[PDB]
From Swiss-Prot, chain B:
Organism: Acinetobacter baylyi (strain ATCC 33305 / BD413 / ADP1)
Regions annotated as coiled coil: none
Protein name: HTH-type transcriptional regulator BenM
A GO MF label: DNA binding
Phylogenetic classification of the source organism: Bacteria, Pseudomonadati, Pseudomonadota, Gammaproteobacteria, Moraxellales
The UniProt record lists the keyword Transcription regulation: yes
UniProt keywords, alphabetically: Activator, Aromatic hydrocarbons catabolism, DNA-binding, Transcription, Transcription regulation
Membership in a protein family: Belongs to the LysR transcriptional regulatory family.
Function: Positive regulator of the ben and cat genes for benzoate degradation. BenM is necessary for ben gene expression but not for expression of the cat genes, which can be regulated by CatM. Binds to the inducers cis,cis-muconate and benzoate.
GO BP of this protein: catabolic process
Amino-acid positions noted as binding cis,cis-muconate in the UniProt annotation, renumbered to this chain: S16, T45, F120
């Protein structure tokens, strides 16, 4: 009668609430508890039994955890309206266009985290952006972009944040992605966790996303 | 090549203000003062006081009035409150017209934040009790984004600043709150001394954007008058 879910903050701005809402409709007397935490912290939390399921954006390998890829969400570049990158609808924008920009990454919690994921995509292609500043969370990064502080790379679903003179630019590199995983304990076999997984599949089928296994 | 400490201006702000007018104010300020280095620091109102006193920041944007002899402040405006509700909540049918505080008393209300005190939740609760209203279903959460997320999940409602409308979550609706005192103040605080020329310029920028937005302000609001 109590399910504990760990989640990275950005998911609040995307599909997480509609999943929980449909999930609620199937379980009118379940106590649902949500806890914002990083993907590495979710792994430790699952092992200690502090949460039952974790929704994250890193693939942390650990025998005690069963991890499953839900979908490959795209990354976008958040910029101020007047930024030159916002003038490139014609040809579009690649990662190698971003290398000399002031880039705002997040979170500032211990590594590995979302900024490590983003920097790895650069390094995967021999790119190393030299001007990086780490901030607490995605909404702060975006507010700072709007204030004129630089640019940021964010999941496409954070476009629910529509700040004055903030524009989101697509990235052309096919691997400019931020996958979303569900993680549970390796011998998890609960009805509640199965139902949660089916609820995600119902939203995806309705939303037109590719179904996970 | 590095900028001088004299031409560096440090600005403290509460995080939720990034959803309203603060960013365009800062952007415009930067654009009009290209030889200034502006540094921005997220901090709560209480921390802003010690920071101003010690020189760690030069101006602080906050939502609380915490009196300290070393500091002075100007009320920039009283921002309206709204009720964040799930699209399918009955209260959402009064979205065009708005609702009153006494309509919310038996609703599942999500208050926030958790840590600081006094905060937004006590201020919200004080507006209820100012009118002999005591909400019976109070659940407190850590932060505004989790409150909004749980409302979007249909687990309750939350009273939020009007600028929160920048965050448009799926199946989340913002309903106007009609009580004229259902407001939340925004302040600029500075050291209790004559404002530097740089802070006076920041005042000028605020006045400019507030005029573009059409806000009503009293005579001599934020206005510098010469000492000679
Ligand atoms: O750090 C990580 O493990 C991943 C994501 C963090 C934050 C977010 O998506 O908002």
């Amino acid at each position: 009668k109590t399910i504990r879910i760990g989640f990275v903050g950005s998911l609040l701005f995307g599909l997480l609430p509609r999943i929980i809402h449909l999930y609620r409709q199937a379980h009118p007397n379940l106590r649902i508890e949500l806890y914002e935490m990083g993907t590495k912290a979710q792994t430790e939390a699952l092992k200690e039994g502090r949460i039952d399921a974790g929704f994250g954006r890193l693939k942390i390998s650990d025998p005690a955890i069963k991890r499953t890829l839900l979908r490959n969400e795209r990354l976008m570049v958040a910029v101020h309206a007047s930024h030159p990158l916002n003038q490139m609808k014609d040809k579009g924008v690649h990662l190698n266009d971003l290398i000399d920009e002031k880039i705002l990454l997040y979170p500032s919690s211990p590594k590995p985290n979302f900024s490590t994921h983003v920097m790895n995509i650069f390094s995967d292609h021999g790119l190393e952006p030299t001007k990086i500043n780490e901030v607490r969370e995605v909404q702060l990064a975006l507010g700072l972009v709007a204030a004129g502080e630089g640019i940021s790379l964010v999941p496409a679903s954070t476009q629910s944040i529509q700040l004055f003179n903030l524009s989101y630019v697509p990235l052309l590199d096919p691997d400019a992605i931020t996958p979303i995983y569900i993680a549970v304990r390796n011998m998890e076999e609960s009805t509640y966790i199965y139902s949660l997984y089916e609820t995600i599949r119902q939203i995806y089928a309705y939303e037109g996303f590719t179904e996970p296994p």
